[PDB]
PDB file of C-alpha atoms in Angstrom:
ATOM      1  CA  UNK A   2      32.307  22.160 -67.820  1.00 27.67           C
ATOM      2  CA  UNK A   3      33.253  18.625 -66.755  1.00 27.26           C
ATOM      3  CA  UNK A   4      35.101  16.048 -68.888  1.00 29.19           C
ATOM      4  CA  UNK A   5      34.465  12.899 -66.845  1.00 26.86           C
ATOM      5  CA  UNK A   6      30.793  13.856 -66.590  1.00 25.06           C
ATOM      6  CA  UNK A   7      29.974  13.138 -70.243  1.00 24.64           C
ATOM      7  CA  UNK A   8      31.703   9.753 -70.217  1.00 26.59           C
ATOM      8  CA  UNK A   9      29.949   8.611 -67.049  1.00 29.91           C
ATOM      9  CA  UNK A  10      26.713   9.488 -68.857  1.00 28.78           C
ATOM     10  CA  UNK A  11      27.827   7.863 -72.109  1.00 30.46           C
ATOM     11  CA  UNK A  12      28.538   4.571 -70.335  1.00 32.65           C
ATOM     12  CA  UNK A  13      25.185   4.853 -68.562  1.00 32.87           C
ATOM     13  CA  UNK A  14      23.422   5.530 -71.867  1.00 30.41           C
ATOM     14  CA  UNK A  15      25.100   2.428 -73.289  1.00 27.66           C
ATOM     15  CA  UNK A  16      23.817   0.234 -70.457  1.00 26.85           C
ATOM     16  CA  UNK A  17      20.460   1.934 -71.017  1.00 28.19           C
ATOM     17  CA  UNK A  18      20.374   0.166 -74.380  1.00 25.65           C
ATOM     18  CA  UNK A  19      20.237   3.566 -76.059  1.00 25.61           C
ATOM     19  CA  UNK A  20      23.298   3.213 -78.282  1.00 21.65           C
ATOM     20  CA  UNK A  21      22.650   6.017 -80.786  1.00 23.01           C
ATOM     21  CA  UNK A  22      22.583   8.730 -78.127  1.00 22.60           C
ATOM     22  CA  UNK A  23      25.436   7.113 -76.203  1.00 22.85           C
ATOM     23  CA  UNK A  24      27.585   7.412 -79.329  1.00 21.49           C
ATOM     24  CA  UNK A  25      26.665  11.092 -79.547  1.00 21.31           C
ATOM     25  CA  UNK A  26      27.365  12.001 -75.912  1.00 22.25           C
ATOM     26  CA  UNK A  27      30.603  10.055 -76.275  1.00 21.18           C
ATOM     27  CA  UNK A  28      31.734  11.634 -79.550  1.00 23.03           C
ATOM     28  CA  UNK A  29      31.033  15.093 -78.139  1.00 21.75           C
ATOM     29  CA  UNK A  30      32.914  14.142 -74.971  1.00 23.45           C
ATOM     30  CA  UNK A  31      36.069  13.490 -76.974  1.00 24.99           C
ATOM     31  CA  UNK A  32      35.827  16.904 -78.650  1.00 26.76           C
ATOM     32  CA  UNK A  33      36.235  18.655 -75.292  1.00 27.19           C
ATOM     33  CA  UNK A  34      38.948  16.260 -74.109  1.00 26.81           C
ATOM     34  CA  UNK A  35      41.005  16.832 -77.242  1.00 27.04           C
ATOM     35  CA  UNK A  36      43.348  14.679 -79.304  1.00 25.79           C
ATOM     36  CA  UNK A  37      45.936  14.754 -76.502  1.00 25.80           C
ATOM     37  CA  UNK A  38      43.641  15.192 -73.508  1.00 25.11           C
ATOM     38  CA  UNK A  39      44.198  13.402 -70.206  1.00 24.81           C
ATOM     39  CA  UNK A  40      41.233  11.100 -70.808  1.00 23.89           C
ATOM     40  CA  UNK A  41      41.733  10.657 -74.549  1.00 22.11           C
ATOM     41  CA  UNK A  42      42.242   6.902 -74.300  1.00 19.23           C
ATOM     42  CA  UNK A  43      39.369   6.146 -71.926  1.00 21.44           C
ATOM     43  CA  UNK A  44      36.986   8.029 -74.214  1.00 23.71           C
ATOM     44  CA  UNK A  45      38.205   6.628 -77.537  1.00 21.56           C
ATOM     45  CA  UNK A  46      38.002   3.056 -76.221  1.00 23.78           C
ATOM     46  CA  UNK A  47      34.410   3.678 -75.159  1.00 24.75           C
ATOM     47  CA  UNK A  48      33.750   5.282 -78.546  1.00 20.39           C
ATOM     48  CA  UNK A  49      35.175   2.135 -80.103  1.00 18.78           C
ATOM     49  CA  UNK A  50      33.018  -0.142 -77.962  1.00 18.16           C
ATOM     50  CA  UNK A  51      29.763   1.661 -78.746  1.00 19.27           C
ATOM     51  CA  UNK A  52      30.459   1.514 -82.478  1.00 16.32           C
ATOM     52  CA  UNK A  53      30.830  -2.266 -82.199  1.00 19.68           C
ATOM     53  CA  UNK A  54      27.368  -2.675 -80.668  1.00 16.07           C
ATOM     54  CA  UNK A  55      26.092  -0.448 -83.482  1.00 14.01           C
ATOM     55  CA  UNK A  56      27.636  -2.280 -86.430  1.00 13.97           C
ATOM     56  CA  UNK A  57      30.261   0.103 -87.790  1.00 14.11           C
ATOM     57  CA  UNK A  58      33.437  -1.974 -87.552  1.00 14.62           C
ATOM     58  CA  UNK A  59      35.617   0.360 -89.615  1.00 14.31           C
ATOM     59  CA  UNK A  60      34.985   3.241 -87.218  1.00 18.88           C
ATOM     60  CA  UNK A  61      35.201   1.157 -84.045  1.00 16.84           C
ATOM     61  CA  UNK A  62      38.546  -0.168 -85.279  1.00 15.22           C
ATOM     62  CA  UNK A  63      39.820   3.361 -85.939  1.00 16.86           C
ATOM     63  CA  UNK A  64      38.702   4.516 -82.489  1.00 12.19           C
ATOM     64  CA  UNK A  65      40.547   1.688 -80.749  1.00 10.08           C
ATOM     65  CA  UNK A  66      43.496   2.243 -83.090  1.00 13.61           C
ATOM     66  CA  UNK A  67      43.592   5.870 -81.974  1.00 15.26           C
ATOM     67  CA  UNK A  68      43.162   4.981 -78.294  1.00 13.50           C
ATOM     68  CA  UNK A  69      46.325   2.901 -78.669  1.00 15.57           C
ATOM     69  CA  UNK A  70      48.295   5.676 -80.378  1.00 15.38           C
ATOM     70  CA  UNK A  71      47.782   7.819 -77.278  1.00 12.75           C
ATOM     71  CA  UNK A  72      48.650   5.012 -74.914  1.00 14.20           C
ATOM     72  CA  UNK A  73      50.779   2.596 -76.880  1.00 13.72           C
ATOM     73  CA  UNK A  74      52.378   1.248 -73.736  1.00 14.13           C
ATOM     74  CA  UNK A  75      49.101   0.344 -72.096  1.00 16.48           C
ATOM     75  CA  UNK A  76      50.729   1.545 -68.900  1.00 15.01           C
ATOM     76  CA  UNK A  77      48.172   4.248 -68.238  1.00 12.90           C
ATOM     77  CA  UNK A  78      45.626   3.826 -65.444  1.00 12.71           C
ATOM     78  CA  UNK A  79      42.419   2.288 -66.779  1.00 13.51           C
ATOM     79  CA  UNK A  80      40.421   5.375 -65.809  1.00 13.95           C
ATOM     80  CA  UNK A  81      42.473   7.389 -68.321  1.00  9.55           C
ATOM     81  CA  UNK A  82      43.953   4.679 -70.560  1.00 12.60           C
ATOM     82  CA  UNK A  83      40.853   2.565 -70.927  1.00 12.21           C
ATOM     83  CA  UNK A  84      42.886  -0.450 -69.974  1.00 11.40           C
ATOM     84  CA  UNK A  85      43.822  -3.361 -72.177  1.00 10.69           C
ATOM     85  CA  UNK A  86      40.444  -3.870 -73.830  1.00 10.05           C
ATOM     86  CA  UNK A  87      41.324  -1.931 -76.966  1.00  4.35           C
ATOM     87  CA  UNK A  88      44.332  -4.170 -77.506  1.00  7.42           C
ATOM     88  CA  UNK A  89      42.016  -7.161 -77.309  1.00  5.05           C
ATOM     89  CA  UNK A  90      39.376  -5.758 -79.651  1.00  2.00           C
ATOM     90  CA  UNK A  91      41.939  -4.586 -82.194  1.00  2.86           C
ATOM     91  CA  UNK A  92      42.891  -8.267 -82.329  1.00  7.30           C
ATOM     92  CA  UNK A  93      39.356  -9.598 -82.797  1.00  8.80           C
ATOM     93  CA  UNK A  94      38.329  -6.841 -85.207  1.00  9.30           C
ATOM     94  CA  UNK A  95      41.457  -7.253 -87.347  1.00 10.66           C
ATOM     95  CA  UNK A  96      40.190  -8.492 -90.707  1.00  6.26           C
ATOM     96  CA  UNK A  97      43.805  -9.449 -91.443  1.00  4.18           C
ATOM     97  CA  UNK A  98      43.981 -12.047 -88.690  1.00  5.07           C
ATOM     98  CA  UNK A  99      47.204 -14.016 -88.400  1.00  5.99           C
ATOM     99  CA  UNK A 100      50.305 -12.483 -86.815  1.00  5.44           C
ATOM    100  CA  UNK A 101      48.518  -9.136 -86.797  1.00  4.29           C
ATOM    101  CA  UNK A 102      45.789 -10.527 -84.541  1.00  3.66           C
ATOM    102  CA  UNK A 103      48.278 -12.420 -82.361  1.00  2.99           C
ATOM    103  CA  UNK A 104      50.386  -9.286 -81.905  1.00  2.89           C
ATOM    104  CA  UNK A 105      47.527  -7.216 -80.481  1.00  2.66           C
ATOM    105  CA  UNK A 106      46.262 -10.174 -78.448  1.00  2.00           C
ATOM    106  CA  UNK A 107      49.639 -10.369 -76.718  1.00  2.00           C
ATOM    107  CA  UNK A 108      49.827  -6.638 -76.035  1.00  2.00           C
ATOM    108  CA  UNK A 109      46.570  -7.086 -74.140  1.00  2.00           C
ATOM    109  CA  UNK A 110      47.535 -10.290 -72.371  1.00  2.00           C
ATOM    110  CA  UNK A 111      50.694  -8.725 -70.946  1.00  2.00           C
ATOM    111  CA  UNK A 112      48.736  -5.750 -69.583  1.00  2.00           C
ATOM    112  CA  UNK A 113      46.167  -8.038 -67.957  1.00  2.00           C
ATOM    113  CA  UNK A 114      48.998  -9.933 -66.264  1.00  2.00           C
ATOM    114  CA  UNK A 115      50.181  -6.597 -64.887  1.00  2.00           C
ATOM    115  CA  UNK A 116      46.754  -5.468 -63.681  1.00  2.88           C
ATOM    116  CA  UNK A 117      46.270  -8.817 -61.944  1.00  2.69           C
ATOM    117  CA  UNK A 118      49.630  -8.925 -60.147  1.00  6.44           C
ATOM    118  CA  UNK A 119      49.139  -5.303 -59.085  1.00  9.26           C
ATOM    119  CA  UNK A 120      45.739  -6.203 -57.643  1.00 10.39           C
ATOM    120  CA  UNK A 121      47.247  -9.261 -55.960  1.00 14.32           C
ATOM    121  CA  UNK A 122      49.663  -6.835 -54.314  1.00  9.48           C
ATOM    122  CA  UNK A 123      46.678  -4.754 -53.204  1.00  8.95           C
ATOM    123  CA  UNK A 124      45.107  -7.744 -51.443  1.00  7.20           C
ATOM    124  CA  UNK A 125      48.211  -7.793 -49.252  1.00  7.53           C
ATOM    125  CA  UNK A 126      47.483  -4.201 -48.221  1.00  9.35           C
ATOM    126  CA  UNK A 127      43.909  -5.399 -47.723  1.00  8.00           C
ATOM    127  CA  UNK A 128      41.510  -2.548 -48.449  1.00  7.61           C
ATOM    128  CA  UNK A 129      38.510  -2.744 -46.158  1.00  6.47           C
ATOM    129  CA  UNK A 130      36.490  -4.826 -48.592  1.00  4.78           C
ATOM    130  CA  UNK A 131      38.587  -7.428 -50.388  1.00  6.97           C
ATOM    131  CA  UNK A 132      35.642  -9.290 -51.904  1.00  4.34           C
ATOM    132  CA  UNK A 133      35.460  -6.571 -54.542  1.00  5.49           C
ATOM    133  CA  UNK A 134      39.128  -7.078 -55.404  1.00  6.98           C
ATOM    134  CA  UNK A 135      38.778 -10.869 -55.501  1.00  2.00           C
ATOM    135  CA  UNK A 136      35.878 -10.574 -57.938  1.00  2.36           C
ATOM    136  CA  UNK A 137      37.731  -8.108 -60.164  1.00  2.00           C
ATOM    137  CA  UNK A 138      40.737 -10.449 -60.205  1.00  2.25           C
ATOM    138  CA  UNK A 139      38.516 -13.349 -61.249  1.00  2.00           C
ATOM    139  CA  UNK A 140      37.233 -11.253 -64.150  1.00  2.00           C
ATOM    140  CA  UNK A 141      40.759 -10.305 -65.218  1.00  2.00           C
ATOM    141  CA  UNK A 142      41.816 -13.955 -65.024  1.00  2.00           C
ATOM    142  CA  UNK A 143      38.839 -15.059 -67.118  1.00  2.00           C
ATOM    143  CA  UNK A 144      39.367 -12.311 -69.685  1.00  2.00           C
ATOM    144  CA  UNK A 145      42.984 -13.429 -69.847  1.00  3.25           C
ATOM    145  CA  UNK A 146      41.940 -17.052 -70.338  1.00  5.71           C
ATOM    146  CA  UNK A 147      39.617 -15.856 -73.113  1.00  3.85           C
ATOM    147  CA  UNK A 148      42.626 -14.187 -74.732  1.00  2.00           C
ATOM    148  CA  UNK A 149      45.069 -17.080 -74.355  1.00  2.00           C
ATOM    149  CA  UNK A 150      42.624 -19.563 -75.865  1.00  2.00           C
ATOM    150  CA  UNK A 151      41.874 -17.090 -78.670  1.00  2.00           C
ATOM    151  CA  UNK A 152      45.540 -17.010 -79.688  1.00  2.00           C
ATOM    152  CA  UNK A 153      45.614 -20.804 -79.858  1.00  2.00           C
ATOM    153  CA  UNK A 154      42.641 -20.739 -82.233  1.00  2.00           C
ATOM    154  CA  UNK A 155      44.695 -18.432 -84.459  1.00  2.00           C
ATOM    155  CA  UNK A 156      47.665 -20.797 -84.282  1.00  2.00           C
ATOM    156  CA  UNK A 157      45.305 -23.729 -84.792  1.00  2.00           C
ATOM    157  CA  UNK A 158      43.882 -21.947 -87.843  1.00  2.00           C
ATOM    158  CA  UNK A 159      45.603 -19.044 -89.613  1.00  2.00           C
ATOM    159  CA  UNK A 160      49.173 -19.667 -88.403  1.00  2.00           C
ATOM    160  CA  UNK A 161      50.391 -23.227 -88.993  1.00  2.00           C
ATOM    161  CA  UNK A 162      53.792 -22.543 -90.567  1.00  2.00           C
ATOM    162  CA  UNK A 163      56.682 -22.754 -88.113  1.00  2.86           C
ATOM    163  CA  UNK A 164      57.566 -25.156 -85.321  1.00  3.74           C
ATOM    164  CA  UNK A 165      57.112 -21.995 -83.262  1.00  2.00           C
ATOM    165  CA  UNK A 166      53.370 -22.463 -83.735  1.00  2.00           C
ATOM    166  CA  UNK A 167      53.315 -25.777 -81.860  1.00  2.95           C
ATOM    167  CA  UNK A 168      55.359 -24.788 -78.804  1.00  2.00           C
ATOM    168  CA  UNK A 169      53.592 -21.455 -78.295  1.00  2.00           C
ATOM    169  CA  UNK A 170      50.320 -23.362 -78.112  1.00  2.00           C
ATOM    170  CA  UNK A 171      51.627 -25.797 -75.510  1.00  2.00           C
ATOM    171  CA  UNK A 172      52.644 -22.850 -73.319  1.00  2.00           C
ATOM    172  CA  UNK A 173      49.358 -21.045 -73.939  1.00  2.00           C
ATOM    173  CA  UNK A 174      47.242 -23.968 -72.723  1.00  2.00           C
ATOM    174  CA  UNK A 175      49.741 -24.428 -69.884  1.00  2.00           C
ATOM    175  CA  UNK A 176      48.802 -20.934 -68.747  1.00  2.00           C
ATOM    176  CA  UNK A 177      45.098 -21.209 -69.586  1.00  2.00           C
ATOM    177  CA  UNK A 178      45.033 -24.338 -67.420  1.00  2.00           C
ATOM    178  CA  UNK A 179      46.405 -22.540 -64.349  1.00  2.00           C
ATOM    179  CA  UNK A 180      44.254 -19.398 -64.347  1.00  2.00           C
ATOM    180  CA  UNK A 181      40.940 -20.934 -65.455  1.00  2.00           C
ATOM    181  CA  UNK A 182      40.594 -24.646 -64.601  1.00  2.00           C
ATOM    182  CA  UNK A 183      36.860 -24.124 -64.063  1.00  2.00           C
ATOM    183  CA  UNK A 184      36.153 -22.722 -67.530  1.00  2.00           C
ATOM    184  CA  UNK A 185      35.043 -25.454 -69.994  1.00  2.00           C
ATOM    185  CA  UNK A 186      36.386 -23.535 -73.010  1.00  2.00           C
ATOM    186  CA  UNK A 187      39.966 -23.979 -71.798  1.00  2.00           C
ATOM    187  CA  UNK A 188      39.744 -27.768 -71.790  1.00  2.00           C
ATOM    188  CA  UNK A 189      38.123 -27.603 -75.223  1.00  2.00           C
ATOM    189  CA  UNK A 190      41.190 -25.628 -76.286  1.00  2.00           C
ATOM    190  CA  UNK A 191      43.420 -28.199 -74.585  1.00  2.00           C
ATOM    191  CA  UNK A 192      41.500 -30.959 -76.346  1.00  2.00           C
ATOM    192  CA  UNK A 193      41.681 -29.190 -79.709  1.00  2.00           C
ATOM    193  CA  UNK A 194      45.449 -28.728 -79.394  1.00  2.00           C
ATOM    194  CA  UNK A 195      45.994 -32.387 -78.462  1.00  2.00           C
ATOM    195  CA  UNK A 196      44.159 -33.299 -81.678  1.00  2.00           C
ATOM    196  CA  UNK A 197      46.718 -31.377 -83.732  1.00  2.00           C
ATOM    197  CA  UNK A 198      49.344 -33.377 -81.862  1.00  2.00           C
ATOM    198  CA  UNK A 199      47.329 -36.475 -82.839  1.00  2.00           C
ATOM    199  CA  UNK A 200      47.195 -37.356 -79.126  1.00  2.00           C
ATOM    200  CA  UNK A 201      43.587 -38.476 -79.438  1.00  2.00           C
ATOM    201  CA  UNK A 202      42.954 -40.227 -76.121  1.00  2.00           C
ATOM    202  CA  UNK A 203      44.133 -37.068 -74.370  1.00  2.00           C
ATOM    203  CA  UNK A 204      41.722 -34.948 -76.407  1.00  2.97           C
ATOM    204  CA  UNK A 205      38.989 -37.161 -74.964  1.00  4.70           C
ATOM    205  CA  UNK A 206      40.067 -36.609 -71.362  1.00  4.53           C
ATOM    206  CA  UNK A 207      39.917 -32.841 -71.805  1.00  5.25           C
ATOM    207  CA  UNK A 208      36.566 -32.934 -73.601  1.00  8.44           C
ATOM    208  CA  UNK A 209      35.184 -35.272 -70.939  1.00 10.89           C
ATOM    209  CA  UNK A 210      36.414 -32.811 -68.309  1.00 10.80           C
ATOM    210  CA  UNK A 211      34.948 -29.843 -70.169  1.00  9.72           C
ATOM    211  CA  UNK A 212      31.565 -31.551 -70.401  1.00 12.12           C
ATOM    212  CA  UNK A 213      31.574 -32.542 -66.729  1.00  9.45           C
ATOM    213  CA  UNK A 214      31.915 -28.865 -65.810  1.00  8.33           C
ATOM    214  CA  UNK A 215      28.521 -27.750 -67.156  1.00  8.16           C
ATOM    215  CA  UNK A 216      26.587 -30.729 -68.557  1.00  7.38           C
ATOM    216  CA  UNK A 217      24.667 -30.868 -65.289  1.00  5.50           C
ATOM    217  CA  UNK A 218      24.101 -27.166 -64.984  1.00  6.98           C
ATOM    218  CA  UNK A 219      20.750 -26.101 -66.421  1.00  6.96           C
ATOM    219  CA  UNK A 220      20.470 -23.384 -69.128  1.00  6.17           C
ATOM    220  CA  UNK A 221      19.519 -20.971 -66.365  1.00  3.87           C
ATOM    221  CA  UNK A 222      23.070 -20.996 -65.076  1.00  4.52           C
ATOM    222  CA  UNK A 223      25.651 -18.377 -66.032  1.00  2.55           C
ATOM    223  CA  UNK A 224      28.297 -21.040 -66.529  1.00  6.53           C
ATOM    224  CA  UNK A 225      26.991 -22.886 -69.566  1.00  8.16           C
ATOM    225  CA  UNK A 226      29.237 -22.207 -72.572  1.00  7.25           C
ATOM    226  CA  UNK A 227      27.926 -19.832 -75.224  1.00  8.50           C
ATOM    227  CA  UNK A 228      26.160 -21.261 -78.281  1.00 11.78           C
ATOM    228  CA  UNK A 229      29.087 -20.941 -80.726  1.00  7.19           C
ATOM    229  CA  UNK A 230      31.372 -22.594 -78.175  1.00  5.27           C
ATOM    230  CA  UNK A 231      29.132 -25.641 -77.805  1.00  2.81           C
ATOM    231  CA  UNK A 232      28.892 -25.884 -81.594  1.00  2.00           C
ATOM    232  CA  UNK A 233      32.699 -26.009 -81.624  1.00  2.00           C
ATOM    233  CA  UNK A 234      32.678 -28.554 -78.798  1.00  2.00           C
ATOM    234  CA  UNK A 235      30.467 -30.774 -80.941  1.00  3.60           C
ATOM    235  CA  UNK A 236      32.857 -30.444 -83.878  1.00  2.00           C
ATOM    236  CA  UNK A 237      35.607 -31.801 -81.613  1.00  2.00           C
ATOM    237  CA  UNK A 238      33.575 -34.622 -80.063  1.00  3.52           C
ATOM    238  CA  UNK A 239      32.853 -36.026 -83.533  1.00  5.09           C
ATOM    239  CA  UNK A 240      36.495 -35.678 -84.595  1.00  6.14           C
ATOM    240  CA  UNK A 241      37.496 -37.645 -81.489  1.00  4.22           C
ATOM    241  CA  UNK A 242      34.837 -40.363 -82.018  1.00  3.46           C
ATOM    242  CA  UNK A 243      32.627 -39.370 -79.080  1.00 10.00           C
ATOM    243  CA  UNK A 244      29.409 -39.105 -81.090  1.00  9.26           C
ATOM    244  CA  UNK A 245      27.136 -40.102 -78.193  1.00  9.64           C
ATOM    245  CA  UNK A 246      28.265 -36.929 -76.428  1.00  8.03           C
ATOM    246  CA  UNK A 247      27.606 -34.654 -79.417  1.00  9.61           C
ATOM    247  CA  UNK A 248      24.221 -36.366 -79.655  1.00  9.52           C
ATOM    248  CA  UNK A 249      23.234 -35.034 -76.228  1.00 10.41           C
ATOM    249  CA  UNK A 250      24.795 -31.624 -76.906  1.00  8.05           C
ATOM    250  CA  UNK A 251      23.009 -30.867 -80.189  1.00  8.30           C
ATOM    251  CA  UNK A 252      19.745 -32.076 -78.648  1.00  8.65           C
ATOM    252  CA  UNK A 253      20.029 -29.145 -76.239  1.00  8.99           C
ATOM    253  CA  UNK A 254      21.061 -26.604 -78.880  1.00  5.18           C
ATOM    254  CA  UNK A 255      18.060 -27.191 -81.147  1.00  6.59           C
ATOM    255  CA  UNK A 256      15.785 -26.696 -78.131  1.00 10.10           C
ATOM    256  CA  UNK A 257      17.314 -23.272 -77.446  1.00  8.84           C
ATOM    257  CA  UNK A 258      17.449 -22.142 -81.079  1.00  7.68           C
ATOM    258  CA  UNK A 259      15.079 -23.659 -83.655  1.00  7.39           C
ATOM    259  CA  UNK A 260      16.805 -21.747 -86.473  1.00  5.41           C
ATOM    260  CA  UNK A 261      20.520 -22.643 -86.515  1.00  8.28           C
ATOM    261  CA  UNK A 262      21.660 -24.502 -89.638  1.00  8.49           C
ATOM    262  CA  UNK A 263      25.076 -26.006 -88.872  1.00 11.99           C
ATOM    263  CA  UNK A 264      23.815 -27.517 -85.614  1.00 11.82           C
ATOM    264  CA  UNK A 265      21.392 -29.715 -87.556  1.00 11.28           C
ATOM    265  CA  UNK A 266      24.001 -30.895 -90.065  1.00 14.13           C
ATOM    266  CA  UNK A 267      26.319 -31.714 -87.156  1.00 13.32           C
ATOM    267  CA  UNK A 268      23.608 -33.515 -85.199  1.00 14.76           C
ATOM    268  CA  UNK A 269      22.868 -35.531 -88.318  1.00 15.60           C
ATOM    269  CA  UNK A 270      26.453 -36.324 -89.290  1.00 14.71           C
ATOM    270  CA  UNK A 271      26.958 -37.360 -85.672  1.00 13.73           C
ATOM    271  CA  UNK A 272      24.136 -39.904 -85.816  1.00 18.51           C
ATOM    272  CA  UNK A 273      25.360 -40.996 -89.242  1.00 17.85           C
ATOM    273  CA  UNK A 274      28.833 -41.817 -87.959  1.00 15.22           C
ATOM    274  CA  UNK A 275      27.408 -43.276 -84.753  1.00 17.87           C
ATOM    275  CA  UNK A 276      25.333 -45.514 -87.001  1.00 22.04           C
ATOM    276  CA  UNK A 277      28.404 -46.559 -88.983  1.00 21.10           C
ATOM    277  CA  UNK A 278      29.914 -47.749 -85.696  1.00 25.27           C
ATOM    278  CA  UNK A 279      26.945 -50.021 -84.988  1.00 29.40           C
ATOM    279  CA  UNK A 280      27.139 -51.531 -88.477  1.00 28.27           C
ATOM    280  CA  UNK A 281      30.728 -52.508 -87.644  1.00 24.32           C
ATOM    281  CA  UNK A 282      29.577 -54.493 -84.593  1.00 22.24           C
ATOM    282  CA  UNK A 283      28.149 -57.534 -86.381  1.00 23.78           C
ATOM    283  CA  UNK A 284      29.767 -56.904 -89.764  1.00 25.73           C
TER     284      UNK A 284
END
């Protein structure tokens, strides 16, 4: 006899690691809410999230797709709407990629910009604890940076047709630079873009800056970039002719995971090319 009750238990069951039951409590929760219930979005988004951690992408994509049909605008309060996350995951999940993925990514980015500015207006009212608001803003900024950089990767990859593709990137990294100067991934994105523009020495500066943001931090620290990000970093360092850097990076990756395949081929090709530079010294 309580709609919110099931969700608050579904989210708790998800953090519990118990996904199977969380999906059940959640799916039942949406039956009571209804197709046009007040909480329809919030539930469907959660339903979508759980089914990602399970493995069923087709269902998770349909959940999020539904959660958007209810709240196309994304205007609705996060408690009911489920916020912009669905927009973001409909972009990642999209097997189509390309302009499809960029479209959804933008729908999410614009909402995050709204949620941030609204929260920045709340700081002015100054609720008794502002540290909670500051933290939440930092998360929204990061999640936005994650989105901006993700669009670039699509324009660096799938979409390389129009001149539009080049300018949109330059504005994306302009924004990524402002909101997340601390995040190494942004400068990797900056670097990667500058490579497309053939501005090689600038790609170095960004990579050097990205490295200097975590290279010191031990693998304890939250801030180290995720594995697949560092693998991408390496792919850039070699393309820029900074093999000595990739050398030190791969050396750390093999220590963390003695099973990855590409990391070894990169570490090798790095020392191959680095070798070819030494052979050029004398002749």
